[PDB]
Amino acid sequence: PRDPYWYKHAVFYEVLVRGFSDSNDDGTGDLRGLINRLDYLQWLGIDCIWLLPIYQSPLRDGGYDISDYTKILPEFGDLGDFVELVDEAHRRGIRVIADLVMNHTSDQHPWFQASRTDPDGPYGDFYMWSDTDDKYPDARIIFVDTEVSNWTYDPVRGQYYWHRFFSHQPDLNYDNPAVQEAMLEVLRFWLDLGIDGFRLDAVPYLYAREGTNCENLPETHAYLKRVRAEVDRLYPDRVLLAEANQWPADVVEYFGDPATGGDECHMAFHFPVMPRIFMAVRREQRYPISEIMAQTPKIPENCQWGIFLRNHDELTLEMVTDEERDYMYAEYAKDPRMKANIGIRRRLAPLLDNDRNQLELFTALLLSLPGSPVLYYGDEIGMGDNIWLGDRDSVRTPMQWTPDRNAGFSRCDPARLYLPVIMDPIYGYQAVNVEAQQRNPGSLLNWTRKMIEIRKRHPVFGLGSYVELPASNPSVLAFVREYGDDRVLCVNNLSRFPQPVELDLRRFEGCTPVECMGGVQFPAIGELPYLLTLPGHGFYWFVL
Amino acid sequence: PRDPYWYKHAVFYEVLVRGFSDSNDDGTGDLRGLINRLDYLQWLGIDCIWLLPIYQSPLRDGGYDISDYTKILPEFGDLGDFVELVDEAHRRGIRVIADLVMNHTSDQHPWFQASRTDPDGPYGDFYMWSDTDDKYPDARIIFVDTEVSNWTYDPVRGQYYWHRFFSHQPDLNYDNPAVQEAMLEVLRFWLDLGIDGFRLDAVPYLYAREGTNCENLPETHAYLKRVRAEVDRLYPDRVLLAEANQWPADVVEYFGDPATGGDECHMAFHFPVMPRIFMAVRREQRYPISEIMAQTPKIPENCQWGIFLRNHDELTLEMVTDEERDYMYAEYAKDPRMKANIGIRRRLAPLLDNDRNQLELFTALLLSLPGSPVLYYGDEIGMGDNIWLGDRDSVRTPMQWTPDRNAGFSRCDPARLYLPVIMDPIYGYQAVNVEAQQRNPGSLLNWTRKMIEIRKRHPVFGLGSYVELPASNPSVLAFVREYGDDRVLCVNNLSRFPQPVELDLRRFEGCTPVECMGGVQFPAIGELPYLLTLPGHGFYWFVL
Amino acid sequence: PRDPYWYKHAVFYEVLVRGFSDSNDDGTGDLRGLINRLDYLQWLGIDCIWLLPIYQSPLRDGGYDISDYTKILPEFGDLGDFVELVDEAHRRGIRVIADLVMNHTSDQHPWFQASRTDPDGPYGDFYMWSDTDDKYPDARIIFVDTEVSNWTYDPVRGQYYWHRFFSHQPDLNYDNPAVQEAMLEVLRFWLDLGIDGFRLDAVPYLYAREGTNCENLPETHAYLKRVRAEVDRLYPDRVLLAEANQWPADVVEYFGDPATGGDECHMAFHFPVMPRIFMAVRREQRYPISEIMAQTPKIPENCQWGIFLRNHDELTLEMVTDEERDYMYAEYAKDPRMKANIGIRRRLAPLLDNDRNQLELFTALLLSLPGSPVLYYGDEIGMGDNIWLGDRDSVRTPMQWTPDRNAGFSRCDPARLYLPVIMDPIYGYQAVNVEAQQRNPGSLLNWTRKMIEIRKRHPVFGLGSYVELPASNPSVLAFVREYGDDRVLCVNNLSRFPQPVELDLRRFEGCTPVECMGGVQFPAIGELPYLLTLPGHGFYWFVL
């Protein structure tokens, strides 16, 4: 056994516990419900469940405002349930990781409250305090629309505290060794229960120094290396993912020193992928995808980029872009499609006007580009979303299972539902739900499952090289993935029209391509250009 | 001006006036409404409107039971409306034809009523009467499940009359010359109003002779040759279409003498086309389509096969087949989906379980095979059925125009609709309507429009020859259509998996194929087999 | 403890087995489903289940065309299921009766097929045959729009047979003693299995005589008296109901000789009740009910009228009327709602524009008038119709149980349902279903349940006398029912406005009226007129 770098050949499934399955029938989904649905996740073929935060919380910012790192919110069950989840998932070959906010806690966290009645106390300097609001002035305000702050004054203490997020999410003093030790305790808590890892949230903002930007500080990276060391020590085969809402170049540093193969975070996310793909389809040219592929620095051997088909990170409803390193920076807002969903999280089918061909194109690229892919619950059946509530952050509607009441999510009265089931004439459950999808062999779900299965039989997709093929046609993106004798050819049409692509496949002369979906043998590769024909927004996968 | 064989390059649009548009707002569609929608039909691109029966009728058999040939059922408007319709159609480059039942009339038709009241008077021999039921004993009973004999006894006259159809649809004695002129009289009436032709319904059964089974009799054919002669004489550019629920070999005689180029019916329908495509897609092999293309006899130069995507005839809800000449006779039966539709008219998308890819495949074929195609109203946006309405009607539901009340068909109270609008979660109007389709550029409606338009620009599709290209892959049907410098290549994949097809296009060496949908110029044809790649159920059109 | 006249205090529940519950999940309801739902029928409080025809049948006429009297349509289960239905119902205090067509059978019945093949055999004179078309000329044709004769000629036999219904329902020759004995055999077969009785269908037409109209003939009544004698001899406590779509004066003979207390049919239906209540509500005056109450002859002591809230009997879709004896004959016609549902079965709530107050008024009267009431399945929660499924079948939609898929009727795929579930925005299952109804204490269902239980605690409703109270207010119908110390006062407002009624109750001077719904004691009855106040379409029940 033993698999230290399993995340390199993993497909992750991000799930909102509150919204996946309700067993108690109280209108809120729970760990037991998720446990009851493990059989589906196995059928789908995913390798790791990624839990959105379930920690105790006032729920004032999506539950990313944590009040107790070691207590599970009563709505979702108890720690006994969680242990059973990790165990039954493992028995099914499925791992479990979770979001965990490292930078800040809610103001309703006991440490906060105990950092203000007595500054003398052991918790007294757990947060960042200053008599003036002038310190750290070159740090931008993240929530510029709501916070005039980054220092706000607390009366019961009689001083200002620091927060890069909302005023009810005070930052933690990471210069304080007791904080470095308490937080590291928290990680151990969950690792002891058997969790396979975390996504460390908001780690760019851990340390602040006068004179700097107060993100990505070398003191910060030092702390994470500390975290990798301890975890590697006490627990085998665990994973640390970084959420860094930054250009993938400032992000490459969260992987640590490349000489060791990686001694910091295992994964971080490559946020510009979806916006650049979006861009490619609109202009019908491969270059926006080509550029980031080429302008991304190399990362340590044992690290991985995470990719998902969304335009915003979730702790900050922002698109990750950069005025000086993103050549498409100004172009995104000149798509009135793109500019209407700015601050809003949208599910994949809505982002693509429910175009099946485009859904396949985007998901095909997601599963084949160099990295480890994340599916968001509901996308595999074409679920929609529901702005209006909350929102900017919902897309947290109940998973749509059957055409029965409440889509089969709960047997409760609809009035008791935490969020309503979508009843829309296009994405509503009477038309879009997992059971209908499963029974129809031509559905998006069955297609996705087949694709996930093709990818599992080919470790090259997570482990292999990426070399893009020159091609006379700007509308087609063709590349090859090779992981020692396991080689695939991936061809993608960004145009809405049928397109020829002529490939110089002379490196593979003599090979007989086998198409992945159907197992059919194509003519052998000779030395003259090979003609592939794709329909609008089509793609093919070939084994060589 | 000057165009006698216009129907050869025409695309027809079959419409139920009752169900297309309601202007009076009484719940029933009318000629006034159709006129109002002529701008749409022009936009869509069709060449000829084919009207379902609008004559005065007891409506006991779909309006195919005519009680007066010269009156429009008041429900639909008046003869002024009909004349304004034809004129406004012609202004737009649209012609108009109608179904007309030649064989029999309603029993409620005044000719019958007079042939029961006055056996000796002028109508006494308009129908076939006899003292016995012992006659023409070799004629099968068509509606064998409802009708015990082809003779039925009338209490008022005291004799049996003949009916090959229902008891309330007595046959006309075509041995009586007064009947032949009365019917020609009927034809002229409508031709004088400007109608561009008819589909003569149920003509295989015009004459009966002892010793014969009473179908396709030479006396029938002579009468039809007679009909064209007078029509050609008195009216320019008219068309006679024959509805013959018969095997395409028995049908070919309705075209007349090949020496004349055609002196009988201009068009007849090739009924087995759809079942063969259906079976071919199911078996994923070209053979069922190839076979009819090759085993169908040549027809006169100025005649053409009519094709449409349905499995049944509309007057006799029967699939056209033949035990001695149909390679597939017993095989339609082994197909669970085929067998489930008794003798039920279904619309295309229900017939294909709403598979967008197959809808395109089948329609590409309808539009590219040798003949003149018929579209059924609603298919162009993917309308469904309502089988629970039965007697066809399944398929005679209201056109779904907008997402407003009654799909935009009428502003009436739903309780007064002649038939209800489909509200189904899959084909229901809140999801499927012309307005949603038009605003979505990727919609089926817009696709159908592009298709009809490229077809219009290439008269080869209606006038040209058919040459099937040999290919090692049995799953793909590839053919060429050529009409003197107008040559197109059509390639169709019957497999649900991607398939390569290698074509020998050396007859076209040097040509740079141009794909019709996007106008992209493909690589030049060399001496080697040309490789086209198709996705599951895909197709391409190339100009040469 | 025998209870020979149990039907006098019974409330019947009419159920379409096909449409009540689906256990097999094949889209068709079955006896097993009905057995499974017996606990609900007990909960509601009904005393007898009445089954619509369940016999083997080609179903060309609602199953009233019987092809085997001793076989159950496989679609519904087998005789084993039936035996279990009778047993499980009886266990719960519920009896079971069924429709049985006495007069005619399907032409697909083995007796017929052997009566036309072999005139010499044992079945040769089972049907009414003739060499001529002229016999029995004074009988109207019932289905006059469809049928030209009451005689139809059979080609295999070479003679005419007799049929008062559709031509595929040939009449049985009851002059033949073997037919008279075959039908009693049919009757005993079911009685042996434990059925508690029958509604004998179409018995007015059993015998035909030259000289008459062939209804209501003494030979017919004699036979029914003969049938009753045999049933009473061999089986205890059974009931025979006659469906005679006739004026209540012509119907009374079916109760037999009054001297014996009743020696023919136990029950027959009073068809004008509902049309008269309907008119009474429309004109807002008591008189139309007063009149049929006055023109209804007294019936033998052990006989009972059957009442239900419908305007048509179900075998013919005709309203009972009589131009010379029904003073309202022409008034039904000037009545626009009435005239639009002329040959259509409608459920109670549609018939009353879904007015809950009127649903209560009509149901209150149904339960208080002299007779034994029949509830139709679905009316108790306010189900609607679907007239587009053909004016019989309009009212045969699946029972709506839960808000889950297919209203909880079946777990099948919707395409497989025998008829669709109503999805209308007023009566659709998402708004109207038993589960929603039972959970709401203010619902029509819970009301109906209470009402039935109140009726059960007072046998006077079925056994007592009926005396109408004179009152100056024409809008109120007030009556008293007395059965030896069980005395109730019923007051009903036919106006849509509040109304006073002043009653002379001196017969009950000293009594403290107790209202049934709530058990509140009203002021004692004095020598002065007693004042009751009712809301629009209101009613009260008082115990004295």
**Hey, where are the domains in chain C?**
1-103+174-463, 104-173, 464-544
* Residue tagged 């009135």 (tokens): A336
Q: Copy the structure tokens of residue B364.
A: 């590409």
Instruction: Give the start-end residues of each E strand in B110-186.
Output: 129-130, 151-154, 159-162
Nearby residues of C79 by Cβ (< 8 Å), 6 or more positions away: C71, C72, C193
SS3 C312: coil
Mark B470-494 as b/e (b = at least 16 C-beta within 10 Å).
ebebebbbbbbbbbeebbbbbbbbb
CB within 8 Å: B133 and C155? yes
By C-alpha distance, which of B5, B149, A497, B243 is closest to C157? B149
Topology adopted by domain B1-103+174-463? TIM Barrel (3.20.20)
The span from the CA of A489 to the CA of A472, in Å, is: 17
Report the residue numbers after which chain B has a gap, meaning the C atom sits over 2.5 angstroms from the next written residue's N, or none: none
Q: Is the minimum CB–CB distance between B155 and chain C shorter than 8 Å? A: yes
Neighbour order of strands in the sheet with C151-154 = C129-130, C159-162, C151-154
SS3 B183: helix
* Consecutive H or E run containing C502: strand C499-503
Nearby residues of B464 by Cβ (< 8 Å), 6 or more positions away: B370, B481, B482, B483, B486, B487
Q: Give contacts of C403 with chain A, Cβ < 8 Å.
A: 405
CB A425 within 8 A of CB A450: no
Q: Give contacts of A403 with chain C, Cβ < 8 Å.
A: 405
The span from the CA of B321 to the CA of B271, in Å, is: 9
The span from the CA of A459 to the CA of A476, in Å, is: 24
CB within 8 Å: B419 and C154? no
Angle in degrees, 0-180, between the axes of helices A287-295 and A273-283, rounded to the nearest 10: 150
- Active-site residues of C, by number, are 201, 243
The span from the CA of C282 to the CA of C353, in Å, is: 13
Nearby residues of A223 by Cβ (< 8 Å), 6 or more positions away: A174, A180, A206, A207
Nearby residues of C518 by Cβ (< 8 Å), 6 or more positions away: none
CA distances to B63, B92, B100 from B77, in Å: 15, 21, 18
The span from the CA of B164 to the CA of B176, in Å, is: 18
> Cα A125 from chain centroid?
33
Name the DSSP letter for residue A339: T
Return the amino acid letter for A395.
V
Q: Which of B154, B388, B423 sits opposite C389 (nearest CB)?
A: B388
β-strand pairing of C467-468 with C48-51 = unpaired
- Active-site residues of A, by number, are 201, 243
| HSE, side-chain direction, 13 A CA sphere, residue C345 | 19
Stated in angstroms to one decimal place, the resolution of this structure is 2.8
By C-alpha distance, which of B93, B57, B100, B48 is closest to B76? B57
The span from the CA of A405 to the CA of C404, in Å, is: 5
The span from the CA of B409 to the CA of B402, in Å, is: 8
CB within 8 Å: B532 and A533? yes
CB within 8 Å: C388 and B420? yes
- Active-site residues of B, by number, are 201, 243
CB A477 within 8 A of CB A469: no
Name the DSSP letter for residue A422: P
Return the amino acid letter for A227.
V
Mark A330-358 as b/e (b = at least 16 C-beta within 10 Å).
eebeeeeebeebeebbbbbbbbbebbbbb
CA distances to A183, B190, B266, B292 from B202, in Å: 87, 19, 16, 24
The span from the CA of B490 to the CA of B506, in Å, is: 16
State the CB neighbour count (10 A cutoff) for residue C428.
17
Q: In terms of C-beta density within 10 A (0-12 exposed, 13-18 middle, 19 or more buried), how is residue C80 classed?
A: exposed
By C-alpha distance, which of C442, C451, C453, C511 is closest to C482? C511
Q: Copy the structure tokens of residue C315.
A: 């075998």
Instruction: Give the start-end residues of each E strand in A238-349.
Output: 239-243, 267-269, 304-308
The span from the CA of A394 to the CA of A347, in Å, is: 9
A vs C, Cβ pairs < 8 A, gives 7
The span from the CA of C62 to the CA of C257, in Å, is: 34
β-strand pairing of A159-162 with A197-201 = unpaired
Phi–psi pair at C515, nearest 5 degrees: -75, 135
The span from the CA of C269 to the CA of C247, in Å, is: 10
Name the DSSP letter for residue B280: H
* Residues in a beta bridge with A12: A48, A374
Q: Which of B133, B152, B419 sits opposite C388 (nearest CB)?
A: B419
Q: Give contacts of C135 with chain B, Cβ < 8 Å.
A: none
Q: Copy the structure tokens of residue B462.
A: 């209606």
Topology adopted by domain C464-544? Immunoglobulin-like (2.60.40)
CB within 8 Å: C402 and A403? no
Nearby residues of A204 by Cβ (< 8 Å), 6 or more positions away: A215, A216, A220, A244, A245, A246
DSSP letters along A2-65, please?
A: --TTGGGG--EEEE-GGGT--SS-SSS--HHHHHHTHHHHHHHT-SEEEEPP-EE---SSTT-S
Q: Which of C25, C400, C402, C405 to mutate to test the interface with A (most CBs of A within 10 A)?
A: C405
Neighbour order of strands in the sheet with A476-483 = A467-468, A476-483, A486-493, A539-543, A514-515
Q: Is the minimum CB–CB distance between C497 and chain B shorter than 8 Å? A: no
Query: Where would I find the H helices in B284-407?
Result: 287-295, 336-340, 348-351, 356-368
β-strand pairing of B129-130 with B159-162 = antiparallel
* Residues in a beta bridge with C514: C521, C543
Name the DSSP letter for residue B474: T
The span from the CA of B426 to the CA of B331, in Å, is: 30
SS3 B517: coil
Q: Copy the structure tokens of residue C378.
A: 């679905």
CA distances to A357, A488, A520, A535, C260 from A543, in Å: 22, 4, 10, 20, 94
CB within 8 Å: A402 and C405? yes
Instruction: Give the start-end residues of each E strand in C233-371.
Output: 239-243, 267-269, 304-308
Q: Copy the structure tokens of residue B90.
A: 């012609």
> Cα B384 from chain centroid?
18
* Consecutive H or E run containing A530: strand A530-534
Q: Give contacts of B160 with chain C, Cβ < 8 Å.
A: 153
Q: Copy the structure tokens of residue A345.
A: 């999280």
Answer left, alpha or beta for residue B481, where phi above 0 means left and psi between -120 and 50 means alpha.
Answer: beta
The technique by which this structure was obtained is: X-ray
Q: Give contacts of C405 with chain A, Cβ < 8 Å.
A: 402-404
Measured CA angle at C294 (ends C288, C296), to 5 deg: 105
| HSE, side-chain direction, 13 A CA sphere, residue C124 | 6
Peptide bond into A391 cis (omega under 30): yes
State the CB neighbour count (10 A cutoff) for residue B259.
8
SS3 B200: strand
Name the DSSP letter for residue A423: -
